[PDB]
From a paper:
Based on the remarkable degree of sequence identity (~99%) of PedB of P. pentosaceus to that of P. acidilactici, we regarded PedB as the immunity protein against pediocin PP-1. The 1.6 Å crystal structure of PedB reveals that PedB consists of an antiparallel four-helix bundle with a flexible C-terminal end.
The initial model was built according to the phased electron density map obtained by using anomalous scattering differences of selenium atoms in the selenomethionyl L24M crystal. A final model for native PedB was refined subsequently to 1.6 Å resolution against native data. The native PedB crystals contain one molecule in the asymmetric unit. Out of the total 112 amino acids in native PedB, residues 7–93 are visible in the crystal structure. The crystal structure reveals that PedB forms a compact globular domain composed of four helices. They are arranged so that α1 and α3 run in the same direction and α2 and α4 in the opposite direction, forming an antiparallel four-helix bundle. The relative disposition of the four helices of PedB is maintained mainly by a network of hydrophobic interactions in the core of the molecule: Phe17, Leu20, and Leu24 from α1 (residues 9–26), Leu48 from α2 (residues 31–49), Val61 and Ile65 from α3 (residues 55–72), Leu74 and Phe76 from the loop between α3 and α4, Leu84 and Ile87 from α4 (residues 80–92) form a hydrophobic core. The C-terminal end of PedB (residues 94–112) that is thought to be important for immunity has no electron density, suggesting that this region is flexible. As expected, the structure of PedB is well-superimposed to that of EntA-im with r.m.s.d. of 1.3 Å for all Cα atoms.
Author numbering: 7 to 93
Write the structure that this text describes.
């Protein structure tokens, strides 16, 4: 299904957006999470929906840990990843 590409596109879109801040250090962990989600999905591990769930949960958690403040656009993509991870 095209669900795989859908997931990859959401992950890369978010990676792009997260690099638009004044610094990148506070976002590196989240970028690592996305790179890993992309690798796992590219290598067909579990399902794209499962990888999206993990990416979303890990980013939501890190946002607490690194006190991250996402933009409307970033939150929109994150919500889309959460949605995909539910259906």
């Amino acid at each position: 299904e095209h669900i795989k590409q859908q997931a990859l596109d959401l992950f890369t879109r978010l990676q792009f957006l997260l690099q638009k801040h004044d610094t990148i250090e506070p976002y590196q962990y989240v970028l690592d999470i996305l790179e890993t989600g992309i690798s796992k999905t590219k290598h067909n591990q579990q399902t794209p929906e499962r990888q999206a769930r993990v990416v979303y949960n890990k980013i939501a958690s890190q946002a607490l840990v690194d006190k991250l403040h996402f933009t409307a656009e970033e939150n929109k993509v994150l919500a889309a990843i959460n949605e995909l991870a539910h259906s």
